[PDB]
Amino acid sequence: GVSEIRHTADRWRVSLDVNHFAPDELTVKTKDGVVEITGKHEERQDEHGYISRCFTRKYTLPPGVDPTQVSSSLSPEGTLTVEAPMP
Amino acid sequence: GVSEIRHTADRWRVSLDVNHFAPDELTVKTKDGVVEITGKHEERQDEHGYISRCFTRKYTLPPGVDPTQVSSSLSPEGTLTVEAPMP
Amino acid sequence: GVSEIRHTADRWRVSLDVNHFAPDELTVKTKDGVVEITGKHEERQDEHGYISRCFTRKYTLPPGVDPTQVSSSLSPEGTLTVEAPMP
Amino acid sequence: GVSEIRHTADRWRVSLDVNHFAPDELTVKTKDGVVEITGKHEERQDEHGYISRCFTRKYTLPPGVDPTQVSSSLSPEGTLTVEAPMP
Amino acid sequence: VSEIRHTADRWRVSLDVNHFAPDELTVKTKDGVVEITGKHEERQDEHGYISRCFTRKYTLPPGVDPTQVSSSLSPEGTLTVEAPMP
Amino acid sequence: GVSEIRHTADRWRVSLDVNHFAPDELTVKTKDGVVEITGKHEERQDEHGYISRCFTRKYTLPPGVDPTQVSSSLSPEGTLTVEAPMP
Amino acid sequence: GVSEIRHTADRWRVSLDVNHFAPDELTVKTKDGVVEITGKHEERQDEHGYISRCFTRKYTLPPGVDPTQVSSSLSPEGTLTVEAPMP
Amino acid sequence: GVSEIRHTADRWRVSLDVNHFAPDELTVKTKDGVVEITGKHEERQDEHGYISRCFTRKYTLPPGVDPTQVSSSLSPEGTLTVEAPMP
Amino acid sequence: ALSRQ
Amino acid sequence: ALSR
Amino acid sequence: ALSR
Amino acid sequence: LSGV
């Protein structure tokens, strides 16, 4: 959903609210200067009934950042933080 | 002769927020006494980058409801209302 | 992945799930009545991150199979089929 | 005097299925802020023929984690868990 | 079942007509309306001999060139009628 | 005298779903040992647009059935049954 | 059921045992002077476990038979009878 | 030292009649603790006409059985016996 | 299913 | 259900 | 690219 | 002789 920007002079960083998705339901790939985040969870009951969800969000990276140095981690509250050093 | 007032049948209803989706991107279908709402929109740009979304939510109708009488309407604020008359 | 073998009176055939390897990363050679299948791919992102893989698989053929008649082909879904006619 | 309660640092964690490999056939090392998980087993017979396997998977650690504090454990089912304390 | 597939650049609809062959379907546009008709003679299906006929109409958005309407039937019996948005 | 028990003839039966047609839009007729069922409804507005439908289906009766003993009944679910006693 | 031939001077008639198939799981079609009988049922529990079945059976008719006069019916014991009048 | 007498493990067994199918028309596979037996033969002439058949039957293995130790054998009479050793 | 705390 |  |  |  809402994405927060936490860039600094030394690190490229974004945080994404994905509270409906578990760690095994998210994927983060980096290719050709674009970070791609995909999520998909099967049908299950929430507070209102049965629902399934899927999404794909893409971020553009500044030029020259090593795609092998991108790290992603989900918090127990459901915040996905994607990070990488600046060139 | 005089005019007459008539009673009207109760109505079952549910409400759902779908502000990210357009009218041509939402479908309402009934199967075996179950209302199925599907939303899907292709990749678009937003404040943070590119995003695409999809979902399917289900509701079990009260017994006796005529599935051919289910209707829905989308408000300007992106709220979808689904209702049907009770027998 | 899974390996399925079927030996009939007219044909010998094995199917192998190698859905992480490209066509130019697989090799099939026959010698001394044994089929040798080797795969290797460099570092590459999958649904969990960067990873490289290698494997060697060997199958013993039935007597009399002509090694010049062994055919191998990879499907779009990543299944490698190696088969040979019986004498 | 009274007893004291203290907070404890979060933990970064990843899990990996490696049921094909024995304990001594797996290694876990850190270098340049990256965790390297390597598996490798020599040729051995199974229900189909003979098979040897190798793989190296990598993970970029979150910024500021002490690489000397990385630990791993392998369940009997065959899942390797790697974790480390956060700053 | 007339699955709508509209976008912002293309008006598109798909219709299930698995009991009809290509030469048994016709699509024509007139006065801002697309008309689809199917008809096939007596013929055996999974239950016995049967003949069928139908006519379906859709309203096009105003300003669609009727010469830009295309119709095609897939091998599984889906008829797709589409046109571009002006 | 004593009361008696008598056997009764079997019954031939077919069922056909005609949920799109109203009772007065269906006809059942027998000609030359063939049961003809015909449905027809005029142009009608539905969820997608306008629609008119027509069909004729035929069933061959077993030999010897009395065509004057053919009957039919339509359930609320829109299923038509056609029945006749066997010789 | 009973899988026997019961031809007479005035009627071509055959019976077939299909006790594992329901009426709606069988189809009889006549084309090019050949009767084609198809059966298929989904995986279901029987006295031994889960099982699915499918079969195609063909009979050759004598010349001159009108395919619109072919009758077929299933008894409660599971015998499918197909018959037609002789020219 | 002296020789030794050892007890042997019990065996699990099921039997199935498949006289309509040749050996090269049957497959036995184990997956997820379930044995899957498939038979399929193309159209051939028999005493009544032409016939093709297909079936798939399943059995649930007892807990603890090694799926790689499942074996089968076809008798001349057409009976297929599948067995495997118990823990 | 988690991720909601 | 089936026949039988 | 890879097969999958 | 030929959904969605």
Numbering used by the authors:
A (entry chain F), B (entry chain E), C (entry chain H), D (entry chain G), F (entry chain C), G (entry chain B), ...: 84 to 170
E (entry chain D): 85 to 170
I (entry chain K): 76 to 80
J (entry chain I), K (entry chain L): 76 to 79
L (entry chain J): 77 to 78, 84 to 85
Could you give the paper's own sentences about this structure?
HspB1, an abundant molecular chaperone, is prevalent in striated muscle where it is phosphorylated in response to cues including mechanical stress. Each HspB1 monomer is composed of a conserved core α-crystallin domain (ACD) flanked by a short flexible C-terminal region, which makes intra-oligomer contacts, and a longer N-terminal domain (NTD). The NTD also confers oligomeric stabilization, with phosphorylation at Ser15 and Ser78 or Ser82 causing a shift from a large polydisperse ensemble to smaller oligomeric species, including dimers. HspB1 is phosphorylated in cells and tissues in response to stretch, inducing translocation to the Z-discs and to regions of increased traction force within the cytoskeleton, suggesting that phosphorylation may trigger or modulate its interactions with mechanosensitive clients such as FLNC at these sites.
